[PDB]
Design a protein around this ligand. Structure first.
Ligand SMILES: Nc1nc2c(ncn2[C@@H]2O[C@H](COP(=O)(O)OP(=O)(O)OP(=O)(O)O)[C@@H](O)[C@H]2O)c(=O)[nH]1
Ligand SMILES: Nc1nc2c(ncn2[C@@H]2O[C@H](COP(=O)(O)OP(=O)(O)OP(=O)(O)O)[C@@H](O)[C@H]2O)c(=O)[nH]1
Ligand SMILES: Nc1nc2c(ncn2[C@@H]2O[C@H](COP(=O)(O)OP(=O)(O)O)[C@@H](O)[C@H]2O)c(=O)[nH]1
Ligand SMILES: [Mg+2]
Ligand SMILES: [Mg+2]
Lengths: 48, 427, 55, 430, 430
């Protein structure tokens, strides 16, 4: 029982339990190499 | 197997909870002696959500009743369904309530908190699984507002994962039953914001307005007003107890409706509420329920949604019905009144369907919504608080119990920021 | 090959079967109309009388 | 003999599944107990005795949907092991169904699917069902596919998924789940079919004459398509088409696999009695935008190779005249580099109708799958909805707390953006 | 002709033997009193007239467990000289059951077993049962084996012992007793099989559908393996394996003898309705980590040579196809040396069922014994548990007070390290 008791001096201050999500600065996304399936060949790159 | 533990605090909590078990007992079909005498096999599928079985065919609810004085408890047991509860779950003190928050939180709360937690420990760890707790209390009082929040902190510390759904009654704007409510509500909100997952706000005046306008009850009593609340708490958990075409339990509701950790206060409403003579005119269709739920008068909280803007909305439908008809209405109501919805969240309306409706009612609906209109209700309690606080009013009663004056300033500041937080997301 | 020729005596079973399933569907929706009207209206008739007369 | 294995994920997958197997047992002539009052080997196994067992696995993270089958009439047909149920669902959260709760049950299911593949001597592919908006459908569906890709390699993993509708929506977080799952399906799936509820919602009201449908009617319409697709492997036909032939003919490149669906005739019993519904008639109805199972009009885009499946009376003579006519139609476009553009299949067994059935017994019917650039319309709508939510960080906290690193949100943005660039580049002509 | 002697020590051994001799009596057709209403004589002696007596010796230092048999139904079957009981148990103390109290009964016991060996003209092995954690199973069992090593020499001695579970434990001093008996077992035993209660508990709940098993259910499972193991000497078969053939094939070295065991099919009646359970399926079920009766993962390490035993209408071809399929499993690791890796046996007598039983009446079954390096995982548990206790000298006073010298504690620790070295050296790359 001694551990449960909460004195008045330990009143719940704001932000103790509501954590905030950090603002997400980011790395450049690894776009086209993220997939093992090769990209389509383009229209202008046709063999003559 | 998603068991839920039920906790009742104070005069408001015990009377609401006692009527709540009358509703469930008839839905599942439990005789007041505690034995099953029902009519369908579907009732026994998932009675484990709320009940335990004593060997002998007697079912016992997972209910714990908490009070500082035993006056209201003995009034409950003398009721018809009072024999149902386990005698050892009645946990009470032997001192006056005081209608005081600090006295309930610090003086009498610490003594009873030791016994209440272990009674919770008995029911919480006796089942195969536990989804979350269920608290019923009022904010204007001293026991439910003060002792209820104390248990809420301990429940969070021991059981962080579980969903701490609470149902609260908010003090009324015109006449409210306690002088010191602005102090009690302001302190209670501080604990509710940081600890609880979901909070529902009920105002007594709306219940009076609903009964007088819609049901045409010439003399509504507190049994009938508490009957309306029992429908909503029954509606939310009905997805757990019965099969449906689209299941939506408590955790689905919290994820969809809550966009940010602190904005989770909710308003509720129930349809169909049929006037005793208007029934001969009302052909009960799916669009008919849609008209009632989004109608501003049906709302159980005295905050007008039209004065604010909606963030999220959810509707539950009970009964065998077309899935197309429900989905079309959700699109129809959203596009018709776009002025009350936020642009940067499309598809603001969540929907669900359940198979088995309440007895007699061939279909029924439940609504839960979140809006910036809650700024109306907080500005009221803040304005009353400041003028009562600017001069040292009744404060000396709380300080004599031991509460430091810095707690109020911390409490009001957190309340003030949540008002601003609703303001900024309206843009 | 283009030998749905059985239709010389095969589509007649089909169309006669089409007729019997047509009647079955209309029986099913007809009885559903009768089931709905009694349930929804006349159980409500008791709710009206009891609530009003007890009041 | 030759086998196909079915996996059903989520509420949509499961309750689609019971409708499909209700259709198949009635089609083959098997009682719900599995006994009899052929092509059984494709979908069923002989346990000994006169009893058969489906080649299916039902997976969900909550027991309500699975327990309906467990107490239902069909409970005796299924093996108790095939019905796998979790403890608590993903709450429509992709991260919860992928990282925290999904990994608690992934290895249990992977044993059971592999164990079923032992009995399938001539296995040639899988069928996998999803609902994109669901947490388990999207979250666990990604984890299942990634593991299944390395477990079996070069085996055709065919998918059939419910794309979120352009306007009808039941989940607020729905755009979040769909885009994250887009990366997983594009690399690992061999081919995945798209359908949306809203098109089925309109089709079942207009063509079929139903005033107010439920999920039950739509799941039966899906079952007809799967029956038509698999009928070539099961029963005799003038032109057989295996799973591999579909894969080669439909998709020009790896990243452009996604087809769309269509079916004809869809007609009420009292209206089907009125007309004869020849081969040319049913072929003409397939190409009207009204009949698409995905609510995107092909006329904004162009057609690549299309596959036609005929189940009924039809035999090649009138097929050639019909496709020749459809080529003359100037309301239908084709990309210049696909002059042939067609693959035709013909089977003799007519469709099977159901007690309480929504449809009549038409003596001939046709099923259609086409690859078109009109599907890019659906991706643009999903892309815009996601950016509105993510600009103000409307729901990031729920996904981050359940194990996801937020850097995966922009990565899922680029993979969809890259896919949109591929379809429009392919749509060009020289 | 050929005879086997079964010895039961402690509570665990005699309680298992109660179920075993139940199973033997029903299988051969002998009433519990020893009369009739072949291979009888490999386990029983024909006393004359028409009565039979088992070849077994029951010993425990306390009379409660034995007196249950003396008052039980089987009291008429046994010869009272065989039932040996002490006065007070070893109190789970190794020193007590080996030096102080074990000496009281050791020479009385050795006369009875030797007297039983005179009637066995063609004896070929012994069957000895232990529980490592118990004082009598370890303290007295170690003493018994040491004498039997010099008495009989190189007659093969096989053991069936219950190893302490990874997490389930009923005695605090359990780690202390196991290590001390490990020194005695490794030198004297010809080959000792491993079982543990924790894996049998999980097996008895999943495969056999039992909510809450007892020691009774687990004891019948072990009897089936021994019945399958000894069935080669009893009944006809296409491929016979003697005890010596088991001995040479399974062990490549002297200190690497410890195998693990498996059995298939273990199925309930209402599940076998859905499964044919042919040779291919039962062979596959053996190698899953779930079916191992010691809770160690074979995927964790490598396999050495395995031995397979079949009981039923099994054709030698289907055996070869099953073994060929197993070698294709890349999840199964074999050592480069021993590419052969297998010995197969076929016998015609199907398994026997028991009234009040838990198993199904399957027409064929397979028993699996394998040598693997994964058991080093189990020894790592016992080593770590011992070090924490001995670091602070948690229970040394009890053992020293009963005559035990402290110097034995590090020496027994020394051997287990050497045994742990031996397995990894062999498990290392060629
Ligand atoms: N066509 C069709 N669509 C369905 C059906 N049932 C559900 N859906 C769609 O599925 C989506 C809902 O997600 P769920 O079915 O619950 O998928 P889930 O992965 O199980 O989601 P969780 O319950 O959180 O695990 C909605 O968008 C529905 O439109 C059905 O019976 N037929
Ligand atoms: N499988 C199985 N294990 C048993 C049974 N009875 C006892 N055991 C095991 O025996 C282990 C301990 O050995 P003891 O029961 O003390 O037997 P003991 O060797 O005679 O030891 P003492 O009684 O002190 O002389 C426990 O861990 C049990 O798991 C049984 O009936 N079946
Ligand atoms: N809906 C409802 N409200 C009640 C009931 N009884 C009391 N209240 C309200 O609860 C508020 C505070 O009640 P209070 O006596 O302080 O409850 P306490 O928490 O036990 O102290 C008052 O404003 C009452 O209007 C009831 O039976 N039903
Ligand atoms: Mg699910
Ligand atoms: Mg003993």
């Amino acid at each position: 029982p001694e551990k449960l008791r909460q004195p008045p001096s330990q009143y719940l201050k704001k932000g103790e339990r509501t954590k905030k999500l950090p603002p997400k600065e980011r790395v450049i996304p690894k776009g086209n190499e993220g997939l093992t399936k090769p990209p389509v060949p383009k229209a202008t790159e046709t063999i003559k | 197997v998603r068991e839920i533990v039920h906790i009742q605090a104070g005069q408001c909590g015990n009377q609401i909870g006692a009527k709540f078990w009358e509703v469930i007992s008839d839905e599942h079909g439990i005789d007041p002696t505690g034995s099953y005498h029902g009519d369908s096999d579907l009732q026994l599928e998932r009675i484990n959500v709320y009940y335990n079985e004593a060997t002998g065919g007697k079912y016992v609810p997972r209910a714990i009743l908490v009070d500082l004085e035993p006056g209201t408890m003995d009034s409950v047991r003398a009721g018809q369904f009072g024999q149902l509860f386990r005698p050892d779950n009645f946990v009470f003190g032997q001192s006056g309530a005081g209608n005081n928050w600090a006295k309930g939180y610090y003086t009498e709360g610490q003594e009873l908190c030791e016994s209440i937690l272990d009674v919770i420990r008995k029911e919480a760890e006796s089942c195969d699984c536990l989804q979350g707790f269920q608290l019923v209390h009022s904010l204007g009082g001293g026991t439910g507002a003060g002792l209820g929040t104390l248990l809420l902190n301990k429940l969070r510390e021991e059981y962080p994962d579980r969903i701490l759904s609470t149902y609260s009654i908010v003090p009324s704007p015109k006449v409210s039953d306690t002088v010191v409510e602005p102090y009690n509500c302001t302190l209670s909100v501080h604990q509710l914001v940081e600890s609880a997952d979901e909070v529902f706000c009920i105002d007594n005046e709306a219940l009076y307005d609903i009964c007088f306008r819609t049901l045409k009850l010439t003399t509504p009593t507190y049994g009938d007003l508490n009957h309306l609340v029992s429908m909503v708490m029954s509606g939310t958990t009905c997805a757990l107890r019965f099969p449906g075409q689209l299941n939506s339990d408590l955790r689905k509701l919290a994820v969809n409706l809550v966009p940010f950790p602190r904005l989770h206060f909710f308003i509720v409403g129930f349809a169909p509420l049929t006037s005793r003579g208007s029934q001969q005119y009302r052909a009960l269709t799916v669009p008919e329920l849609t008209s009632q739920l989004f109608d501003n008068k049906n709302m159980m909280a005295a905050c007008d949604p039209r004065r604010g803007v909606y963030l999220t909305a959810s509707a539950h439908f009970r009964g065998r019905m077309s899935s197309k008809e429900v989905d079309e209405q959700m699109l129809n109501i959203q596009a018709r009144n776009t002025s009350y919805f936020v642009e940067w969240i499309p598809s603001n309306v969540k929907s669900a369907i359940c198979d088995i409706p309440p007895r007699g009612l061939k279909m029924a609906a439940t609504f839960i919504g979140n809006t910036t209109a809650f700024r109306e209700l907080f500005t009221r309690v803040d304005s009353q608080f400041q003028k009562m606080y600017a001069r040292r009013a009744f404060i000396h009663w709380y300080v004599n119990e031991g509460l430091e004056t810095v707690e109020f300033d911390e409490a009001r500041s957190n309340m003030t920021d949540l008002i601003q937080e609703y303001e900024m997301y309206e843009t | 090959g283009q030998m749905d020729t059985q239709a010389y005596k095969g589509m007649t079973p089909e169309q006669i079967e089409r007729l019997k399933q047509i009647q079955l569907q209309q029986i099913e929706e007809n009885r559903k109309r009768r089931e709905a009207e009694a349930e929804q209206e006349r159980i409500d008739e008791e709710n009206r009388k009891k609530a009003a007369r007890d009041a | 003999m030759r086998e196909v294995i079915s996996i059903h994920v989520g509420q949509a997958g499961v309750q689609i599944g019971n409708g499909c197997w209700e259709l198949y047992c009635l089609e083959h002539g098997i009682q719900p107990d599995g006994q009899l009052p052929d092509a059984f080997n494709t979908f069923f196994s002989e346990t000994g005795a006169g009893k058969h067992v489906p080649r299916a696995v039902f997976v969900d993270l909550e027991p309500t949907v699975v327990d309906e089958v467990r107490t239902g009439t069909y409970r005796q047909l299924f093996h108790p092991e095939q019905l796998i149920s979790g403890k608590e669902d993903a709450a429509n959260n992709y991260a919860r169904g992928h990282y925290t709760v999904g990994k608690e049950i992934i290895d249990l299911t992977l044993d059971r699917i592999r164990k079923l593949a032992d009995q399938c001597t001539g296995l040639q592919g899988f069928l996998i069902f999803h609902s994109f908006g669901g947490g388990t459908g999207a979250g666990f569906g990604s984890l299942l596919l990634e593991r299944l890709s390395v477990d079996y390699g070069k085996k055709s993993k065919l998918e059939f998924t419910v794309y979120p509708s352009p306007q009808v929506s039941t989940a607020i977080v729905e755009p979040y789940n769909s885009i994250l799952a887009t990366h997983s399906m594009i690399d690992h799936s061999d081919c995945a079919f798209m359908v949306d509820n809203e098109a089925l919602y309109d089709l079942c009201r207009r063509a079929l004459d139903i005033e107010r449908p439920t999920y039950t009617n739509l799941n039966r319409l899906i079952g007809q398509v799967v029956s038509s697709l698999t009928a070539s492997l099961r029963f005799d036909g003038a032109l057989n088409v295996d799973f591999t032939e579909f894969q080669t003919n439909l998709v020009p490149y790896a990243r452009i696999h996604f087809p769309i669906c269509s079916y004809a005739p869809v007609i009420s019993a009292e209206k089907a009695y009125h007309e004869q519904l020849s081969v040319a008639e049913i072929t003409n109805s397939l190409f009207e935008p009204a009949n698409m199972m995905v609510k995107c009009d092909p006329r904004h885009g162009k057609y690549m190779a299309c596959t036609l499946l005929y189940r009924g009376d039809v035999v090649p003579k009138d097929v050639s005249a019909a496709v020749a006519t459809i080529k003359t139609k100037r309301t239908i476009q084709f990309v210049d580099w696909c002059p042939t553009g067609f693959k035709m299949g013909i089977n003799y067994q007519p469709p099977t109708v159901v007690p309480g059935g929504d449809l009549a017994k038409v003596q001939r019917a046709v099923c259609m799958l086409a690859n078109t650039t009109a599907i890019a319309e659906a991706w643009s709508r999903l892309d815009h909805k996601f950016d509105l939510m993510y600009a103000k960080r409307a729901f990031v906290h729920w996904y981050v707390g359940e194990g996801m690193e937020e850097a995966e949100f922009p990565e899922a943005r680029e993979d969809l953006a890259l896919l949109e660039k591929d379809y429009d580049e392919v749509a060009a002509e020289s």
